[PDB]
Design a protein around this motif. Structure first.
Motif, PDB file in Angstrom:
ATOM      1  N   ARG A 111      -0.951   5.126  -0.231  1.00  0.00           N
ATOM      2  CA  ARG A 111      -0.998   6.303   0.758  1.00  0.00           C
ATOM      3  C   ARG A 111      -0.047   7.346   0.134  1.00  0.00           C
ATOM      4  O   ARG A 111       0.057   8.294   0.740  1.00  0.00           O
ATOM      5  CB  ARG A 111      -0.798   6.036   2.071  1.00  0.00           C
ATOM      6  CG  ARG A 111      -1.532   4.698   2.362  1.00  0.00           C
ATOM      7  CD  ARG A 111      -1.211   4.438   3.854  1.00  0.00           C
ATOM      8  NE  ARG A 111      -2.050   2.919   4.401  1.00  0.00           N
ATOM      9  CZ  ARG A 111      -1.509   2.387   5.631  1.00  0.00           C
ATOM     10  NH1 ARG A 111      -0.423   2.845   6.100  1.00  0.00           N
ATOM     11  NH2 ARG A 111      -2.172   1.634   5.940  1.00  0.00           N
ATOM     12  N   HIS A 112       0.951   6.783  -0.837  1.00  0.00           N
ATOM     13  CA  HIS A 112       2.040   7.800  -1.247  1.00  0.00           C
ATOM     14  C   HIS A 112       1.253   8.897  -2.187  1.00  0.00           C
ATOM     15  O   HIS A 112       1.158   9.938  -1.838  1.00  0.00           O
ATOM     16  CB  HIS A 112       2.748   7.077  -1.964  1.00  0.00           C
ATOM     17  CG  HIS A 112       4.352   7.912  -2.226  1.00  0.00           C
ATOM     18  ND1 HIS A 112       5.341   7.445  -1.561  1.00  0.00           N
ATOM     19  CD2 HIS A 112       4.518   9.080  -2.723  1.00  0.00           C
ATOM     20  CE1 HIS A 112       6.214   8.522  -1.944  1.00  0.00           C
ATOM     21  NE2 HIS A 112       5.757   9.456  -2.706  1.00  0.00           N
ATOM     22  N   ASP A 113       0.684   8.420  -3.200  1.00  0.00           N
ATOM     23  CA  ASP A 113       0.045   9.484  -4.255  1.00  0.00           C
ATOM     24  C   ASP A 113      -1.057  10.175  -3.524  1.00  0.00           C
ATOM     25  O   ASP A 113      -1.365  11.288  -3.753  1.00  0.00           O
ATOM     26  CB  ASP A 113      -0.304   8.745  -5.400  1.00  0.00           C
ATOM     27  CG  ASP A 113      -1.254   9.604  -6.460  1.00  0.00           C
ATOM     28  OD1 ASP A 113      -0.647  10.551  -6.595  1.00  0.00           O
ATOM     29  OD2 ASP A 113      -2.351   9.221  -6.579  1.00  0.00           O
ATOM     30  N   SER A 114      -1.784   9.211  -2.879  1.00  0.00           N
ATOM     31  CA  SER A 114      -2.950  10.003  -1.785  1.00  0.00           C
ATOM     32  C   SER A 114      -2.314  11.121  -1.085  1.00  0.00           C
ATOM     33  O   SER A 114      -2.855  12.135  -1.396  1.00  0.00           O
ATOM     34  CB  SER A 114      -3.425   8.985  -0.985  1.00  0.00           C
ATOM     35  OG  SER A 114      -4.441   7.863  -1.747  1.00  0.00           O
ATOM     36  N   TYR A 150       0.245  12.455  -1.825  1.00  0.00           N
ATOM     37  CA  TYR A 150       0.824  13.187  -2.657  1.00  0.00           C
ATOM     38  C   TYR A 150       0.325  14.301  -3.270  1.00  0.00           C
ATOM     39  O   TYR A 150       0.640  15.571  -3.149  1.00  0.00           O
ATOM     40  CB  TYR A 150       1.316  12.327  -3.555  1.00  0.00           C
ATOM     41  CG  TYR A 150       2.622  12.836  -4.588  1.00  0.00           C
ATOM     42  CD1 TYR A 150       3.651  13.237  -3.564  1.00  0.00           C
ATOM     43  CD2 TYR A 150       2.459  13.259  -5.895  1.00  0.00           C
ATOM     44  CE1 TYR A 150       4.858  13.491  -4.450  1.00  0.00           C
ATOM     45  CE2 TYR A 150       3.672  13.552  -6.654  1.00  0.00           C
ATOM     46  CZ  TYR A 150       4.724  14.048  -5.667  1.00  0.00           C
ATOM     47  OH  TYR A 150       5.947  14.463  -6.386  1.00  0.00           O
ATOM     48  N   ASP A 158       1.112  -1.069  -0.052  1.00  0.00           N
ATOM     49  CA  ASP A 158      -0.074   0.049   0.095  1.00  0.00           C
ATOM     50  C   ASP A 158       0.866   1.370  -0.004  1.00  0.00           C
ATOM     51  O   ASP A 158       0.399   2.444   0.269  1.00  0.00           O
ATOM     52  CB  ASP A 158      -0.887  -0.109   1.307  1.00  0.00           C
ATOM     53  CG  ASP A 158      -1.968  -1.052   1.140  1.00  0.00           C
ATOM     54  OD1 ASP A 158      -2.600  -1.104  -0.070  1.00  0.00           O
ATOM     55  OD2 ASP A 158      -2.247  -1.619   1.937  1.00  0.00           O
ATOM     56  N   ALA A 159       2.144   1.153  -0.128  1.00  0.00           N
ATOM     57  CA  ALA A 159       3.048   2.122  -0.177  1.00  0.00           C
ATOM     58  C   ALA A 159       2.616   3.226  -1.284  1.00  0.00           C
ATOM     59  O   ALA A 159       1.899   4.368  -0.734  1.00  0.00           O
ATOM     60  CB  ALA A 159       4.554   1.778  -0.616  1.00  0.00           C
ATOM     61  N   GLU A 160       2.746   3.020  -2.543  1.00  0.00           N
ATOM     62  CA  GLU A 160       2.210   4.030  -3.531  1.00  0.00           C
ATOM     63  C   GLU A 160       1.029   4.526  -3.434  1.00  0.00           C
ATOM     64  O   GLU A 160       0.322   5.552  -3.680  1.00  0.00           O
ATOM     65  CB  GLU A 160       2.246   3.088  -4.999  1.00  0.00           C
ATOM     66  CG  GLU A 160       1.453   2.240  -5.115  1.00  0.00           C
ATOM     67  CD  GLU A 160       1.688   1.520  -6.317  1.00  0.00           C
ATOM     68  OE1 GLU A 160       2.050   1.836  -7.126  1.00  0.00           O
ATOM     69  OE2 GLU A 160       1.148   0.259  -6.525  1.00  0.00           O
ATOM     70  N   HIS A 185      -1.143  16.423  -0.424  1.00  0.00           N
ATOM     71  CA  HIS A 185       0.078  17.387  -0.148  1.00  0.00           C
ATOM     72  C   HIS A 185       0.083  18.616  -0.510  1.00  0.00           C
ATOM     73  O   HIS A 185       0.123  19.656  -0.284  1.00  0.00           O
ATOM     74  CB  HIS A 185       1.341  16.442  -0.446  1.00  0.00           C
ATOM     75  CG  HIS A 185       2.511  17.500   0.095  1.00  0.00           C
ATOM     76  ND1 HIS A 185       3.434  17.257   0.798  1.00  0.00           N
ATOM     77  CD2 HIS A 185       2.902  18.724  -0.631  1.00  0.00           C
ATOM     78  CE1 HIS A 185       4.404  18.229   1.182  1.00  0.00           C
ATOM     79  NE2 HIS A 185       4.116  19.308   0.315  1.00  0.00           N
TER      80      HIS A 185
END
Length: 28
Positions: free
Chosen positions: A5-8, A10, A1-3, A13
């Protein structure tokens, strides 16, 4: 689930940095 919550957080942000850049940047 990295990418995940990352792009999310992201784009979100960018949302926070855009808000502060709007108030703070507007009168920066």
């Amino acid at each position: 689930d990295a990418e995940f919550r990352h792009d999310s957080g992201y784009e979100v942000h960018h949302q926070k940095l855009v808000f502060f850049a709007e108030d703070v940047g507007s009168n920066k």
